[PDB]
Design a binder for this molecule. Structure first.
Ligand SMILES: [Zn+2]
Lengths: 107, 571, 97, 6, 91, 96, 91, 92
């Protein structure tokens, strides 16, 4: 369980990562134990054996946020006559969340 | 102000001093950790322990993935090649040995080998070890032609574009044509199966192979073909490689306007993505300085080569073939810059290094020696003229006479008798025989240099005009038939002002030739006129010669990637 | 030329035959060792019986798969092919321990 | 003057 | 204000916040939703984490110091393990 | 300055003070961490009795032997059931 | 005319006689009171002998070959034990 | 004309490519082989790999007993000194 490089499946680790990262953006309460663990799994994926899962992680979080803003853009688009209050409603939940995700992906 | 060492750097030195006990478990470290352990071994000077693990392909596979610190791997790799152990040769052999073992294996394991082959083969191609990069690329090409799938021909064409690049720098031009023909087999097969492969980089390699064999008509034809298929989605390294070798074909085609808009953008684009201390950036300057060398931009042509060499020297260690070629251009640039002054002090030292680096790493019959030994012989020729002691002159001219014919024979074997480079040596020998007092042999050499170089280039070319000047300078002094040189000199000035204007360096020795020709027969109505021409010559070029380098000349480029491509193509 | 081996229980015949050589004539070579009739013995590549009429090149035993470095394999029956042995495995070294 | 271009 | 660091085996390594923030990782570990003090390490064991906390006090006060800084002592057996945790802690 | 590795069971309390600082005022630092009375804990400096008063100058370790590069340790435990517990410090681990 | 070869596991490696002339040690089995000729080769296992007699077919066919001879693949895991047979058989 | 490579010379190329994973296993081989393994180190150019095999007196003694190819051994021992490794200083 040490931080030595090791072979780790990407689907299971991403799925366990997907729960918290879905709440890191679009701010929500996340458990203390999760934040410590969800930073460890990033090291375990970028230092994966025998090939680092950094290209996969970068292109899967990008496609994760691809399905986030697009799903968020639909809600703002259908909210006619109140786009300004809705745009800032999610921007404060995203711009801080973007720094929140940048905080998690430091390594 | 005594900033404490980072725990990252502090722990690096903590395991290097205990390397022997923990040697096995260092290979289990992460790649970012692993590289800094090895780079510290070079910094401490423990090259033997550094070379104790780069000789394994698997260890060197992880190290090659440190893309940010690739500039440090090159400096360590060259250090090992000066340290002794042939880490380039063993890695190529070890990769080629393991490559043939997965021929019957699945394509999942196989595809990893090509990925390893391209990063390792590309690195050795960057490091200059073309003789070992070829064996790497030939192995990965073999895998791509085993199982017939659409992706396999998509990378087989990617081997032949780089196979043709490691054979252009290794002077294997005879095998270069076969690779291009072999490339068209998979390229056409991919085109039939609904995939038009990009013929931009692959056509771009002929812009150097045919340029090397002085096939300027064919190279410029392939210069246009290569430039058409460029695309903004291509890698920047691929794009800049096309522009450099396309610009070179324009310089020898006696076209200057479209060449500078190509190569300056090549300098700008290379400096942007890579930087000012990258090997690809320095590769552009040598091609860029080739433009400045032929447009009589002599003042900054030496500087741009001096800048180019310093980039390679900071990244490519000591005895490296790329440093020698950088040494080669700077050695010749100082040869023409110090022609009137005679200060061939650093010119010979760069030339001496050019011989020194290549002879250690390349075979004695390699063609790059012929290019390298030619310039050093030109250094020895002008040195013997400037020296006062006649005993020194008679020895150094023979030493230069040794190099030219040894260089000429290598050119003759690889290029054929009817080629510019073989005729280029004939022009050198004619000038050499003038200093060697073999005037009758000088006459034979000059007529050989002018009946062959002019035969295929045409009646109007830069180098043909100089070859006339060599024989024009002959009849003025040794043969003393001034009627022959009267028509010859008139040709030298004629071609000189077509492209270079009046203020050209070779024209100074041409206008002076007419006065010297006229002074013998007592003609004076033209001597007074041509003395005013020299006064016009002495000022007009020096009116517009003020100090200005080329790195800030290009500066930021208003021209974009597409603004340069279409402008050159339509014109 | 086509090179291949046959194993019934523990035997291994390293014989050679032309790419157009058929199946009937190579059983005579096998008869010289096992002393068994050619019709009784039957050979089995990739769990498939081979006919006597078809040649070695018509069943897939071509030159590239039957090289003199790593030839193609085929069984034999009258399958009970015994594996040779388990080589001592080598640590990957590069793999973390 | 000086020499041929390389 | 004090930050509690727990290793893999549960042994805790409380230390001041100001000396902790010299590490980019722990700066990006307490920040975000973890602001709530308390962080945990699933992979890092105690013996190396004891040396990291030892380094934390070393960095802050020896920064831009006029005197000659003594070298940081690292055990030869801990040297490999501490280096592995150096990049992860980014310190 | 004098640096300490005062610890108890799983705790590895990190703190710093001056060379002439009182041993008593270090307990106020512990009071600000675990929120315990200063007399609740007992200082077992090198498995022996250490008085609540005194000072760090003659405590038994100075700035030279307690540098941040290698600070010294002092045992500690809290009084449970009105009885002062003995020191219960354990090694971190046993790496190979 | 046919030369047999037994292994540690009892595997049979009956092959052609003139394919075995490359290694002189096999001829020593045929020589002496050995003159199929019974041979005992217990110390060398079957899996490595699957490459020993395999080399014989590679050896005899490429004797004075006009084309360039491809290398004989020797797996890295079996490299140590196969080299034992190379010195033992003088092949 | 184009003779096939010897099985001994083919196998010696197999071990030398696998040198990292089998460096510790090569010391148990017979004395008539270990010289060839360390000779293939020098022939391929592995000067730095060979230094770790001659600075050790325990394994250099087995190479020293292969006196048939002592003329080759004198060249390898001289090669490392020009290479930079002071095997003689370490052996002493
Ligand atoms: Zn060395």
């Amino acid at each position: 369980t040490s931080l030595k490089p090791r072979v780790v499946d990407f689907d299971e680790t991403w799925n366990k990562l997907l729960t918290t990262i879905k709440a890191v953006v679009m701010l929500e309460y996340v458990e203390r134990a999760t934040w410590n663990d969800r930073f460890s799994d990033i090291y375990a994926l970028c230092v994966a054996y025998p090939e680092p899962l950094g290209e996969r992680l970068y292109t899967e979080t990008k496609i994760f946020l691809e399905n986030h803003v697009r799903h968020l853009h639909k809600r703002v688009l259908e909210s006619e006559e109140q786009v300004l209050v809705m745009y800032h409603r999610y921007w404060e939940e995203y711009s801080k969340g973007a720094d929140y995700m940048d905080c998690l992906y430091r390594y | 102000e005594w900033i404490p060492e980072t725990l990252y750097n502090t722990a690096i030195s903590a395991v290097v001093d205990n390397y022997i006990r923990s040697r096995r478990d260092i290979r289990s470290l992460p790649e970012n950790i692993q590289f800094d352990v090895y780079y510290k071994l070079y910094q401490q000077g423990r090259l033997c322990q550094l070379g104790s693990e780069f000789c394994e392909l698997e260890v060197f596979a992880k190290v090659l993935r440190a893309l940010d610190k690739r500039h440090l791997l090159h400096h360590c790799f060259q250090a090992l090649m000066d340290h002794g152990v042939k880490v380039a040769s063993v890695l190529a052999y070890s990769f080629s040995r393991r490559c043939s073992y997965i021929a019957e294996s699945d394509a999942a394991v196989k595809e990893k080998a090509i990925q390893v082959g391209f990063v390792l083969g590309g690195f050795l191609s960057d490091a200059g070890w073309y003789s070992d990069a070829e064996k790497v690329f030939l192995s990965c090409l073999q895998l791509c032609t085993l199982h017939d799938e659409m992706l396999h021909w998509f990378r087989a064409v990617e081997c032949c574009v780089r196979l043709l690049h490691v054979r252009n720098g290794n002077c294997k031009y005879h095998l270069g044509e076969e690779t291009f023909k072999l490339a068209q087999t998979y390229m056409d097969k991919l085109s039939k199966h609904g995939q038009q492969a990009n013929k931009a980089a692959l056509y771009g390699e002929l812009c150097a192979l045919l340029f090397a064999k002085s096939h300027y008509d064919e190279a410029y034809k392939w210069c246009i073909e290569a430039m058409k298929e460029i695309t903004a989605g291509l890698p920047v390294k691929v794009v800049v490689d096309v522009l450099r070798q396309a610009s070179k074909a324009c310089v020898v085609k006696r076209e200057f306007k479209k060449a500078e808009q190509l190569i300056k953008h090549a300098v700008y684009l290379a400096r942007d993505h890579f930087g000012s201390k990258h090997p690809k950036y320095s590769d552009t300057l040598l091609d860029y300085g080739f433009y400045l060398l032929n447009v009589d931009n002599i003042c900054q042509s030496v500087a741009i080569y001096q800048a180019a060499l310093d980039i390679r020297q900071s990244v490519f260690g000591g005895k490296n073939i790329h440093v020698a070629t950088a040494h080669e251009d700077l050695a010749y640039s100082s040869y023409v810059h110090q022609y009137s002054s005679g200060k061939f002090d650093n010119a010979l030292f760069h030339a001496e290094r050019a011989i020194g680096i290549i002879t250690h790493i390349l075979p004695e019959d390699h063609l790059l020696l012929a290019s390298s030994k030619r310039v050093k012989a030109l250094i020895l020729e002008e040195i013997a003229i400037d020296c006062h002691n006649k005993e020194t002159e008679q020895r150094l001219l023979q030493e230069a006479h040794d190099l030219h014919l040894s260089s000429l024979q290598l050119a003759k074997k690889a290029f054929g008798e009817f080629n510019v480079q073989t005729a280029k040596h004939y022009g050198n020998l004619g000038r050499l025989y003038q200093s060697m007092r073999k005037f009758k042999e000088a006459e034979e050499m000059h007529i050989k240099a002018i009946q062959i170089k002019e035969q295929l280039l045409g009646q109007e070319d830069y180098e043909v005009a100089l070859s006339v000047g060599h024989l024009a300078s002959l009849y003025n002094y040794d043969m003393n038939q001034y009627e022959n040189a009267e028509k010859l000199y008139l040709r030298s000035i004629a071609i000189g002002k077509k492209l270079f204007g009046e203020g050209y360096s070779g024209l100074e020795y041409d206008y002076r030739g007419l006065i010297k020709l006229y002074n013998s027969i007592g003609n004076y109505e033209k001597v007074f006129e041509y003395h005013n021409v020299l006064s016009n010559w002495n000022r007009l070029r020096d009116r517009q010669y003020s100090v200005t380098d080329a790195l800030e000349d290009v500066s930021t480029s208003p021209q974009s990637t597409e603004e340069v491509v279409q402008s050159f193509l339509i014109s | 030329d086509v090179f291949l081996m046959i194993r019934r229980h523990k035997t291994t015949i390293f014989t050679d035959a032309k790419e157009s050589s058929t199946v009937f004539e190579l059983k005579r070579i096998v008869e010289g060792i096992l002393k068994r009739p050619p019709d009784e013995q039957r050979l089995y590549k990739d769990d498939q019986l081979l006919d006597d009429g078809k040649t070695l090149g018509e069943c897939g035993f071509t030159s590239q798969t039957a090289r003199p470095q790593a030839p193609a394999t085929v069984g034999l029956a009258f399958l009970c092919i015994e594996p040779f042995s388990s080589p001592p495995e080598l640590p990957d070294v590069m793999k973390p321990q | 003057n000086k020499g041929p271009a390389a | 204000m004090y930050v509690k660091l727990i290793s893999s085996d549960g042994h805790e390594f409380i230390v001041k916040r100001e000396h902790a923030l010299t590490s980019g990782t722990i700066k990006a570990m307490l920040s975000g939703p973890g602001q709530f003090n308390e962080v945990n390490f699933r992979e890092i064991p105690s013996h190396v984490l004891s040396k990291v906390c030892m380094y934390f006090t070393y960095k802050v006060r020896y920064t831009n110091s006029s005197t000659e800084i003594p070298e940081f002592p690292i055990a030869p057996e801990i040297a490999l393990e501490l280096l592995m945790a150096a990049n992860f802690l980014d310190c």
